[PDB]
Amino acid sequence: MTPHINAKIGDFYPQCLLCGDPLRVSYIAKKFLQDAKEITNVRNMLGFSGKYKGRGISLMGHGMGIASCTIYVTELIKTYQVKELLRIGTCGAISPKVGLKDIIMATGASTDSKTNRVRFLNHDLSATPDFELSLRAYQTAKRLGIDLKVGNVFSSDFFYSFETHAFDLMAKYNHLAIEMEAAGLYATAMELNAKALCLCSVSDHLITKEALSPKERVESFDNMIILALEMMS
Amino acid sequence: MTPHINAKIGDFYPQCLLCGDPLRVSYIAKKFLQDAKEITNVRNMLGFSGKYKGRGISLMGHGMGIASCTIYVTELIKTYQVKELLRIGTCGAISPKVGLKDIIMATGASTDSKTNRVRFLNHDLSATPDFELSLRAYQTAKRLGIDLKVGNVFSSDFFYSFETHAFDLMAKYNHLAIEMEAAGLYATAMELNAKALCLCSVSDHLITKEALSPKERVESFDNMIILALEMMS
Amino acid sequence: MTPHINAKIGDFYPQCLLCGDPLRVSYIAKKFLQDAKEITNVRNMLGFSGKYKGRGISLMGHGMGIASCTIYVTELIKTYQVKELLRIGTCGAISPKVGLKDIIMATGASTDSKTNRVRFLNHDLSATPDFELSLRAYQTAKRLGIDLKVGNVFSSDFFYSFETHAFDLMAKYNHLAIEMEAAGLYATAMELNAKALCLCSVSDHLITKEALSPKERVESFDNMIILALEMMS
Amino acid sequence: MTPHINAKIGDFYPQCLLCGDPLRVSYIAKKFLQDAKEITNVRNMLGFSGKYKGRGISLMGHGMGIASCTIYVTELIKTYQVKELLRIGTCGAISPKVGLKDIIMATGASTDSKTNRVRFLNHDLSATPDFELSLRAYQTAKRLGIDLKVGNVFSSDFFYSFETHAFDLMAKYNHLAIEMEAAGLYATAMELNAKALCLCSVSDHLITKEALSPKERVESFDNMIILALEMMS
Amino acid sequence: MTPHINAKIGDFYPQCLLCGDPLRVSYIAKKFLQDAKEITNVRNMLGFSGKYKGRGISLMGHGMGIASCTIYVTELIKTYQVKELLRIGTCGAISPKVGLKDIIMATGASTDSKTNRVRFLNHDLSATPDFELSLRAYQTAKRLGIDLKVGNVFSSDFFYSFETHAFDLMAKYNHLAIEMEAAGLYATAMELNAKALCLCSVSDHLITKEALSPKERVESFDNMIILALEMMS
Amino acid sequence: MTPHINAKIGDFYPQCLLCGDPLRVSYIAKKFLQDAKEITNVRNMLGFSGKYKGRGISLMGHGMGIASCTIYVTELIKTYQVKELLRIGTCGAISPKVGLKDIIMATGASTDSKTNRVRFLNHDLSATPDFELSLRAYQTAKRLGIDLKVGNVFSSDFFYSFETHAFDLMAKYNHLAIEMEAAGLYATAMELNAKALCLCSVSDHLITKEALSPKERVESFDNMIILALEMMS
Numbered sequence A, B, C, D, E, F: 001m002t003p004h005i006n007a008k009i010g011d012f013y014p015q016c017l018l019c020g021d022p023l024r025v026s027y028i029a030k031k032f033l034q035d036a037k038e039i040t041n042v043r044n045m046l047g048f049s050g051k052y053k054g055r056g057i058s059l060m061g062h063g064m065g066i067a068s069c070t071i072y073v074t075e076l077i078k079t080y081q082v083k084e085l086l087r088i089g090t091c092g093a094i095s096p097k098v099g100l101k102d103i104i105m106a107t108g109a110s111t112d113s114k115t116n117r118v119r120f121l122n123h124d125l126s127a128t129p130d131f132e133l134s135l136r137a138y139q140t141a142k143r144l145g146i147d148l149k150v151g152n153v154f155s156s157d158f159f160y161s162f163e164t165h166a167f168d169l170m171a172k173y174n175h176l177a178i179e180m181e182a183a184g185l186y187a188t189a190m191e192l193n194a195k196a197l198c199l200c201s202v203s204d205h206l207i208t209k210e211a212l213s214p215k216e217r218v219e220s221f222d223n224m225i226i227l228a229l230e231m232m233s
């Protein structure tokens, strides 16, 4: 129906888990869902619908960066009637308050993008998640025994930053890590009256240069997948 | 020992309620606190310390606008050891999702100020409250039977706006009301690693133009004072 | 009559002395005026009308920062028919050309605020005083034998600056001191076709670190008060 | 070896064709290359190395938006030593000088992104291709009988624009069409001293609403693919 | 001695009259000065030194636009030791407070240029003249019977404006006319510790569309030349 | 027929060589053209029409800086029907890729001006030349044995820069030299659907501090004059 999704209307459940990497979306479908069906594959951006503990859930890839994420989120809401969007992904830590394998709930997404100024009268849009979803993540993490870290992230247009000298200042202002999509998800969900939240897993520390190995990346990401699926039950 | 506060070091409790109007601060001290002492009065900007249900509580006026708010909040944190700052105040509603008497909890504060661009590398700082405090407000409001509305506010440098044509756009993006200080409170608490939250009571609707009577403004504000004091007890 | 002033129309004389501190406004009324009457007290922001050497003079406090100052100045012009607004206050000197106790007449007010960009097509508004009032201040200072320093000030949204490294640059560009309201007074008076001027007294030197004692502050400020009242006779 | 490309060092030829859609990349490898090997597939972002008329050429997908494109282009140039990057793709025409089927060569890429201001001291970076490549494209098109349209494109962070009222203005300034990556490819190739060029095929007209069927889209895209490969051969 | 001035060190008097049009500079030297010597002519941009009523007077052309004016003013101050710079020129009136043949003294120069943001830490520089010079102009105009109009001008990078819809707003904020150099003269003189002032004669009314004939333009300009020379004696 | 040009309609050929220095325009007319006639001289900004190798050529001075250039280019296109504008000039090198006496073809013109943001929706206009003219310059330089350097220039509002610390960054991004008009010529020709190109000759190296002597300046400029006239023949 859209240039970027070839699902039929109704193929998506009203709650959708989002991730930048469509191969990880496929991995979640195979490992954690029952009866999962591939519903879209335009540009190799895979999405699925299946069941977790008897509950229907959808999964959709969104690519990297605010511009890509905004395209998919816009279409999910406007065309596919998605109401609740839970994004997961990795991030690079910049604060001493977090370490490798930590899960962060982004109560705000700062950015170096111009997109929110374009959307919002050239002023400062404070891009934020839906509070009910934030409460649900916090409650579910308490239930599962997960030490959820809570603060802002910085959504950058740059993976290869030209402003590494500014990381300490961002950490001072309660930015725990850097990723590339949260501000676009939040602003699009705000634009279109939908509920959204971003969780992210610390795979790399940008201050120490320490990184997880491939094997511990998969293990730690699984912990955040389970948090997300449990919160959608 | 600041240009703006003449309290002695140690006169403030670590939890402080903030309001822009020092006469409303004095009203809270007289009506709701026990043994309230006026601890500061530079520029007629009054602050107090007293007890609510046996628990020490301080109150501080902060004046109008981000620049004034920032001065007082900075001094409270850096000189007076204040750790938790709960701002209450009125606001002008701009969204159909709220009406007069509603209490809004601002999970984000957008702004037309340049102050956060000056603080934050000329990028977009998403100014947000402390999550734990927002959870406490949610739980306390539920206990008290308050239908707490949760979303963004827009903190303006203007009371007499030159951009009233933009109010519908702001409301579309989940801005429930306009006030003049929240983004500064939030940014200063982020800067200084303190816990802050803003609650605001809808006194007027800037769109549909309804307005509370002076007698309803008292009952509605009292409702929000009680929420705040119960939160800090 | 407004949310911020509870005077009756007619209570203000057409010339009004402005100061951020309502307690200093009261002090001027009691020390320097005859038959002074308190005409407003909303938010503890006092204003008065009285006589100086047989001539009617009003005084009004305006709080701290551009947003606070703009609210009061807007209402004084639009509602209370004030035509001439003479602001006094303290400042932090940044130029070697001034020292403690000097009085500065601001022939321009630069700013880090975004307010003038919002007002003025996103361009640079050169915020300036009324020329007749500047001439009167210059002539009155000569008459009184005051060495009036004439240059720009920098009106900042920050008392606790994040840009102290730029003070020398600002002084190079003929900024003699920093305060927090002149640019808003000037822009509002420009907006509404009224006459405004700001004088400020050097209470502290931000470069040399020299500072007046509490008692020296009161004595030098009196010299400014006299200059101002004399220009309004 | 890089986070977004799992090719071996040396798997890329120094000439690489780029496209946002990795499924079109795989289509090109299957239909136009001989002995094509899939050399990378992280995030389902496919790249290939194969031969066209006896010469080795590589293909790489880059996703949607400047941020995504910049990631892949940076890694291609640095880790994989790619020297010539020829991007093809579709675009939405905004000018009367072009229509469906037309191939545009972008001698400049304007943008609503902030990325180039971040890169370029907050000034205006004129993002441009390598001139020798643009000359090779012009000569190859002439030899093949292609009526190459030459002008600027506008690279937007938005597929769903909030500024459709501005399309006529852009077309007046010689912007023939809108796409989402050219300015990022050009800025990154400038940063890293590599040769880049963007060609795009008009598949939709955003003014008139002309739109090609899936069959015409394939046939018109083939003409661009052949132009690109002939340029590299 | 500089790339733009071929005068010898010492050829300029410390007082210099400035004008954009070097042909008008030559006209002033021939008609109003005694013993006038042409001291510079690079790029046909003429300067002179002569006598007016026994007093040494220099004249220098500066071209059109802030960037051109800035070049000449910088060299006059830094290399040729000029201390006082009095600019005359024409302007396009935008205010009902002025009409054809009026002389405006610019106590502020607003601008659409980025130059002052580049100079002034990305903030708003309020570009203003030296007050002593403005007082001398006021007194001299009174002595000569000239009804000098006093307010801001808007210095634009555009003669052929793209923002004519904004002229009324500019006029509301006390901008009497538009020209193209004042803000650059004022900022450069502030930078380099020199005394500057701009006067301009209304040659065309941009609102009412009134314009002066070629012959009328000459006679009204003479009145401003005499004012400037009388002020410099 | 305009405020800045007093030629009659029809006095300009449709191809015009442009230079900032009207005395250099005069020098070109007398040394390289046959039957040259002065056609305009407002503000001493000279322009001529003559023949080179039997072919009609016009020459016009445009002064210094984007604002001055824009005035003349706008009038030449809109009033005098000029269709092709070839600008020559000097520049200050900032890249190791170029040295004194090198001729640069500017395939893009970056800028610190605000003019293109004002023209272009506050976004980034990539200011570029006409491709056919650039091909003609490239081919003509090859024919004449000139080693034409091809890259971006930076068109600045400043001859005396406040940002010399950024020169290396701009060179990294393929900016070979700094001048002051190219971005304005390019934006105006794009605005008005005309063909433009800028060549510039390195007179000074801003990094190494090398400079040409006065006689070297004339001799090296002659080589680019011949290049330009040859491409117009």
Ligand SMILES: Clc1nc(Cl)c2[nH]cnc2n1
Residues within 6 Å of the ligand: A090, A091, A092, A156, A158, A159, A160, A178, A179, A180, A203, A204, A205
């Ligand atoms: Cl390690 C890492 N991860 C992510 Cl998600 C990033 N986003 C921007 N820079 C980044 N670095």
Ligand SMILES: Clc1nc(Cl)c2[nH]cnc2n1
Residues within 6 Å of the ligand: B090, B091, B092, B093, B156, B158, B159, B160, B178, B179, B180, B203, B204
């Ligand atoms: Cl009614 C109302 N209240 C507040 Cl606090 C405001 N701030 C800015 N505009 C406003 N309107």
Ligand SMILES: Clc1nc(Cl)c2[nH]cnc2n1
Residues within 6 Å of the ligand: C090, C091, C092, C093, C156, C158, C159, C160, C178, C179, C180, C203, C204
């Ligand atoms: Cl000492 C001093 N006084 C004032 Cl009024 C100020 N405004 C901003 N910084 C300041 N410092």
Ligand SMILES: Clc1nc(Cl)c2[nH]cnc2n1
Residues within 6 Å of the ligand: D090, D091, D092, D093, D156, D158, D159, D160, D178, D179, D180, D203, D204
């Ligand atoms: Cl049809 C179309 N195609 C592309 Cl590539 C676009 N980019 C931004 N808007 C767009 N519209």
Ligand SMILES: Clc1nc(Cl)c2[nH]cnc2n1
Residues within 6 Å of the ligand: E090, E091, E092, E093, E156, E158, E159, E160, E178, E179, E180, E203, E204
């Ligand atoms: Cl009539 C006229 N004169 C001048 Cl000096 C101008 N500057 C910018 N627009 C203008 N119009």
Ligand SMILES: Clc1nc(Cl)c2[nH]cnc2n1
Residues within 6 Å of the ligand: F090, F091, F092, F093, F156, F158, F159, F160, F178, F179, F180, F203, F204
């Ligand atoms: Cl040497 C030199 N030449 C030119 Cl054309 C310039 N433009 C800006 N700075 C400059 N330096």
Ligand SMILES: [Mg+2]
Residues within 6 Å of the ligand: A019, A020, A021, A088, A089, A090
């Ligand atoms: Mg991820």
Ligand SMILES: [Mg+2]
Residues within 6 Å of the ligand: B019, B020, B021, B088, B089, B090
């Ligand atoms: Mg309030």
Ligand SMILES: [Mg+2]
Residues within 6 Å of the ligand: C019, C020, C021, C088, C089, C090
């Ligand atoms: Mg004060």
Ligand SMILES: [Mg+2]
Residues within 6 Å of the ligand: D019, D020, D021, D088, D089, D090, D091
């Ligand atoms: Mg594409």
Ligand SMILES: [Mg+2]
Residues within 6 Å of the ligand: E019, E020, E021, E088, E089, E090
């Ligand atoms: Mg002039």
Ligand SMILES: [Mg+2]
Residues within 6 Å of the ligand: F019, F020, F021, F088, F089, F090
């Ligand atoms: Mg030149």
